[PDB]
Ligand binder design. Structure first.
Ligand SMILES: Nc1ncnc2c1ncn2[C@@H]1O[C@H](COP(=O)(O)OP(=O)(O)O)[C@@H](O)[C@H]1O
Ligand SMILES: Nc1ncnc2c1ncn2[C@@H]1O[C@H](COP(=O)(O)OP(=O)(O)O)[C@@H](O)[C@H]1O
Length: 374
């Protein structure tokens, strides 16, 4: 029973509909899951029953191979006896009123990651439930608004190269469907955190940063001449930047998440923190958590050094393949989370340094600054 159909873009329709996820005319469905991909409750239990034991069995193997998932994650499995070849498992957050904006961030991310997986498998149609609104306690209104916003951003941020043509928003309950239909109706340069830490969008080369600390993205072997970000810093710094990094790196088993500190030489800052950022890897649990850990660590270092400001470029969004909107939203959320749960003595400003030519990054950050400021 269809409640509304809304044309998003040429060839793309959003359909709000009462129905059962186990039985819909789509290529793939998104299951509302948990960290262990264990389908003991809610919609997941109904899906699992209709699928038979293959679904849980393949999920157990995925968790065994890649480890447990975290909130705001998604993965894909086999579908057993469902009328689909795969099921996408979204892990929404467990709701807390004390952490509402972070929960919003994590639900949105699980949806964005699920869409990405669908587009990677070239699917044309997907059904999506009110993830987190059952056992995980997310207030129904905010939940559906968040899911619908994620979908709008999916087609609005990058308009090119989408395979998806039908998106179904579904639940067995008439009340949840009406919430979805209402959400659809409604949806279609400086920030400051509660603790006082301020975020600035700065449109220039990171080699022109005038913060205490500047963040660089480097590969495993610490060579600074290979990515356009490090190369820009190396050219403005002088070759002693390379020699000092190699020196401070001696004896380090460098890996994803390694952060090494050097002086600035010809740069206008006091220190450079060189980070080894993860590959996107289809938005894996590790890729997202490690990037967040890196961002938190650079801030903690700046605080521990009694300094006031740090400049981040859009690390991970070139060679390493992080979608730029997803990254911007990740670093912004992380800065709010850290700022909110910590009493900072000296750290007061975070600058996002975006290259003048990088219009996609500028739009990513501007869009999120706008959502946050409203
Ligand atoms: N057995 C079921 N059959 C159909 N829908 C269900 C069933 N159990 C829960 N739901 C609905 O699925 C949606 C998601 O809830 P749930 O499965 O608990 O996911 P979550 O843990 O992420 O909140 C909610 O609308 C919930 O009412
Ligand atoms: N001089 C610069 N200042 C700020 N940002 C830059 C500069 N040069 C490139 N960028 C942006 O830095 C981001 C990261 O690029 P890259 O050097 O490939 O690092 P990564 O391996 O972490 O993806 C890209 O979005 C690129 O557009």
């Amino acid at each position: 029973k269809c409640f509304s159909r809304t044309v998003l873009a040429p060839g793309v329709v959003l359909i709000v509909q009462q129905g059962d996820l186990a039985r819909l005319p789509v290529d793939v469905v998104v299951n509302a899951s948990n960290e262990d991909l264990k389908h003991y409750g809610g919609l997941a239990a109904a899906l699992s029953k209709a699928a038979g034991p293959e679904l849980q069995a393949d999920c157990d193997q995925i968790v065994k191979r890649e480890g447990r998932l975290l909130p705001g994650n998604a993965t894909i499995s086999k579908a057993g006896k469902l009328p689909y070849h795969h099921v996408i498992h979204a892990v929404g957050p467990r709701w807390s009123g004390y952490e509402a904006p972070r929960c919003v961030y994590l639900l949105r991310r699980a949806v964005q990651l699920s869409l990405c997986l669908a587009e990677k498998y070239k699917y044309r149609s997907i059904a999506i439930p009110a993830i987190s609104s059952g056992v995980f306690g997310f207030p129904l209104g905010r939940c559906v608004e968040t899911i619908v916003s994620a979908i709008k951003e999916n087609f609005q941020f990058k308009k090119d190269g989408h395979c998806l043509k039908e998106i179904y928003l579904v639940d067995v309950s008439e009340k949840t469907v009406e919430a979805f239909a209402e959400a659809v109706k409604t949806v279609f340069g400086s920030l400051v955190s509660p603790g006082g830490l301020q975020m600035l969008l700065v449109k220039e080369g990171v080699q022109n940063a005038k913060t205490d600390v500047v963040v660089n993205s480097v590969p495993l072997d610490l060579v600074l001449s290979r990515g356009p970000l490090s190369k820009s810093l190396l050219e403005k710094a002088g070759p002693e930047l390379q020699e000092e990094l190699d020196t401070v790196g001696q004896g380090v088993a460098v890996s994803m998440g390694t952060v090494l500190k050097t002086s600035s030489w010809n740069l206008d800052c006091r220190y450079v923190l060189h980070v080894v950022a993860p590959e996107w890897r289809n938005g894996s649990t590790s890729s997202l958590k490690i990037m967040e850990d890196i961002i938190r660590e650079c801030m903690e270092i700046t605080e521990s050094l009694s300094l006031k400001s740090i400049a981040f470029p859009a690390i991970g969004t070139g060679n390493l393949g992080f979608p730029k909107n997803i990254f911007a939203e990740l670093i912004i959320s992380e800065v709010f989370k850290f700022s909110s749960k910590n009493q900072l003595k000296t750290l007061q400003e975070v600058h996002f340094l975006l290259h003048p030519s990088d219009h996609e990054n500028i739009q990513a950050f501007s869009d999120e600054f706008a959502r946050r400021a409203n």
